[PDB]
Design a binder for this molecule. Structure first.
Ligand SMILES: Cc1cc2nc3c(=O)[nH]c(=O)nc-3n(C[C@H](O)[C@H](O)[C@H](O)COP(=O)(O)OP(=O)(O)OC[C@H]3O[C@@H](n4cnc5c(N)ncnc54)[C@H](O)[C@@H]3O)c2cc1C
Ligand SMILES: Cc1cc2nc3c(=O)[nH]c(=O)nc-3n(C[C@H](O)[C@H](O)[C@H](O)COP(=O)(O)OP(=O)(O)OC[C@H]3O[C@@H](n4cnc5c(N)ncnc54)[C@H](O)[C@@H]3O)c2cc1C
Ligand SMILES: O=C(O)c1ccc(O)cc1O
Ligand SMILES: O=C(O)c1ccc(O)cc1O
Lengths: 394, 394
């Protein structure tokens, strides 16, 4: 079996890269461990930066998003009784963010890939990577007991945090940066009207709470929860009572609750590897870095990594400028570190940490008061929230 | 002995409050433990916000400052080889800061107080405060062996961090917030031309360094130093070699060194007490809060506390609105907490901390890169650096 670009993983990263490449005439094959049904069962993210919205349009997979996605011009932050709205549009110079679920984006891409007939192998077991520094790297995998080999020019590791691609680079070539937080988020998807037209991040003494949405009739809520909690200890009833306790009264009063469609606990973490490539292997998305979901940068960093990789592969194939691929990491990392700093900052001011002394609590409260009450403070949040500009390469 | 306002301490706070009050017709007596010579030997701070510059003018003690002080429109931050200038004037909407030493301000006030004949008792030993909640509080002290009593209406505790006034409030009425940093600043005063027309804060891998000044022929430099260091372990020669090692080469190359006039180590700390008053006693300056010197807010918070206390005492005496004095703490604390947050922030991004893991070092470097390269980021530093607006009271 032979292709130009082998893509490990059929999540947002792999599918988006694959569609962009296909549309440009660059053959690519995607290998996925799971079934399409399993991939479609993941709920996850719901906020898209303008940059990712444009990338989807460029990949020609935006009809459903332009119809069902909700454009948001502001977000609210609630702390100490008050609610402060950050006008993203005004403060960022006119940029907005789009709420359209990660599940929906994935379904749209899977649908577009099937229609075009590009190759996708689901249930590709025991995927292994070889000859990464050769002129001809290859991938071996198993489809129903028999071991097959796939030859290619390049390999894009879009296999997420637990993927095989990052594990295939000699550990000595990689520098890891990581921070584990002492809490996770318990999320709940409900077929109920959202409590607000815009998102609400809430810093409350009992912990963080977030009111989000997927459409006019589907809501998504999250509450900060200790690492020790098991999802089976949280009945729907317990969740609503707790969400309500963390929100301002005028918001909790008008909350329409209902049974959960999905409920899960995701732990918070920061992780970056440098470089993000080795020979003919390039990491993209969760395979290369993780951010706590507080700034909604996860799916968005995957998109920029992909936008950068795709434009560099295009130069390599169409223009014969294969040497530009050496710049991938440098380019991606500048954006990744700023998104990591923003996500770290949002996380530290909105959540309640266990070992907190009095001085730090007061500093946390003051950060909010300063950033939310100063025009310059609001602009730092806003420009970071809509997404800093993608670099153009060279 | 009888007066209207008893003032404990003849540092910047007490003298400024005393001059303002005297000029308005409100009698006040200042009690100081040390001699005038001892007070004048302290070097300390050198940066004044516009607010403090206006307060000095209002107190009529600005002739020398208007002549010898240097107005600065920007400051530089050096990190990772580069130097970035923050245009304070442009970014703050036209505000600047004035470099005029704390020693000079103190000398100017002491001179003005002597000329007007207001009462100042130096070497007032064993000062004690009594009947703080009565209608008539009083102060007792010792002048050459004999114990004297001073009756008054109000007492202003302007006695610094180790003063007796904060110690005189029942510990149970006070809430303390404090953070001790694992380093101090080794400062050096030299009769040499400063290396730059503007200040330079430097984040270097060996530690923080700061290039400041007092005039066109007098310089002040500081280097971050461990808590374990003794000043006698730092010869002038050792200091210059170390300063030079922490600065960018084009700056170190042109540094004019020379023997020290003064050299001392000051440890870094944050401290706030709430409330800042008890009965007829009001705390002002270092007696109520401490900030690390990184943001130069120490002497500046003393000035705002004083400006607030003076305007409230004026209302009380001239207008009979004695009830407004209950608002002192609330008003002062809003400004103190924002200055504390700023000083904490400056401190954490410019200094090298001992227990730092890789992720944090990268986050520290990114904070600098973001704040120094974004117009909104630069504006947060600038507005905070020139000094947030004084509240007008009511
Ligand atoms: C559990 C979890 C919860 C999240 N929750 C949120 C959230 O609530 N909000 C938010 O803002 N962000 C959240 N995120 C982040 C956001 O969803 C991710 O950044 C985004 O999914 C990244 O996309 P990706 O394509 O890089 O990886 P993924 O979506 O993880 O997809 C990678 C794919 O590779 C496949 N794969 C793995 N190993 C192999 C292999 N060995 N061979 C072949 N295929 C393989 C996997 O099956 C998977 O399909 C969450 C992420 C995770 C892991
Ligand atoms: C050692 C030190 C170094 C500093 N270095 C810097 C620096 O390098 N840069 C910078 O930006 N800021 C620095 N600061 C901070 C800045 O100088 C202070 O915030 C400023 O001096 C506060 O003024 P104040 O009037 O409140 O107190 P102070 O200047 O401390 O004066 C209070 C006065 O009260 C007197 N007193 C004390 N106890 C009694 C008593 N029991 N009875 C009567 N009188 C008493 C003291 O003798 C003293 O004269 C420094 C402060 C200190 C303590
Ligand atoms: O899923 C969401 O809708 C959501 C929204 C904002 C964010 O920060 C993280 C999230 O998971
Ligand atoms: O003394 C100074 O000149 C000086 C300047 C700036 C600052 O942050 C702290 C300082 O002590």
């Amino acid at each position: 079996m032979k292709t130009q670009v082998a893509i490990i993983g059929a999540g947002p990263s792999g599918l988006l890269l694959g569609q962009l490449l296909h549309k440009a005439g660059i053959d690519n094959v995607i290998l996925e461990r799971q079934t399409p049904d399993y991939v479609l069962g993941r709920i996850r993210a719901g906020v898209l930066e303008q940059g990712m919205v444009d990338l989807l349009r460029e990949a020609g997979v935006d009809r459903r998003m332009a119809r069902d996605g909700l454009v948001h011009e502001g977000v609210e932050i609630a702390f100490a009784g008050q609610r402060r709205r950050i006008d993203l549009k005004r403060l960022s110079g006119g940029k907005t963010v789009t709420v359209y679920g990660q599940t929906e984006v994935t379904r749209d891409l899977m649908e577009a890939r099937e229609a075009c007939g590009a190759t996708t192998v689901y249930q590709a077991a025991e995927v292994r990577l070889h000859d990464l520094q050769g002129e001809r790297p290859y991938v071996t995998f198993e489809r129903d007991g028999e071991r097959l080999r796939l030859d290619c020019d390049y390999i894009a590791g879009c296999d997420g945090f637990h993927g095989i691609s990052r594990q295939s680079i000699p550990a000595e070539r990689l520098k890891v940066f990581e921070r584990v937080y002492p809490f996770g988020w318990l999320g709940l998807l409900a077929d109920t009207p959202p409590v607000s037209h815009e998102l609400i991040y809430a810093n409350h003494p009992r912990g963080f709470a977030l009111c989000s949405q997927r459409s006019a009739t589907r809501s998504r809520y999250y509450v900060q929860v200790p690492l020790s909690e098991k999802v089976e200890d949280w009945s729907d009833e317990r969740f609503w009572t707790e969400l309500k306790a963390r929100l301002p009264s005028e918001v909790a009063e008008k909350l329409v609750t209902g049974p959960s469609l999905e409920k899960s606990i995701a732990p918070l973490r920061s992780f970056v590897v440098e470089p993000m490539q080795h020979g003919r292997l390039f990491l993209a998305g969760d395979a290369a870095h993780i951010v706590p979901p507080t700034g909604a940068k996860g799916l968005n960093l995957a998109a920029s990594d992909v936008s950068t990789l795709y434009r560099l592969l295009l130069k390599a194939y169409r223009e014969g400028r294969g040497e530009l691929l050496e710049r991938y990491s440098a380019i991606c990392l500048r954006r990744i570190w700023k998104a990591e700093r923003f996500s770290w900052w949002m996380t530290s001011v909105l959540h309640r940490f266990p070992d907190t002394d009095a001085f730090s609590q007061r500093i946390q409260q003051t950060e909010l008061e300063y950033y939310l009450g100063s025009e310059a403070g609001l602009a730092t949040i806003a420009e970071n929230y809509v997404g800093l500009p993608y670099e153009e390469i060279e």
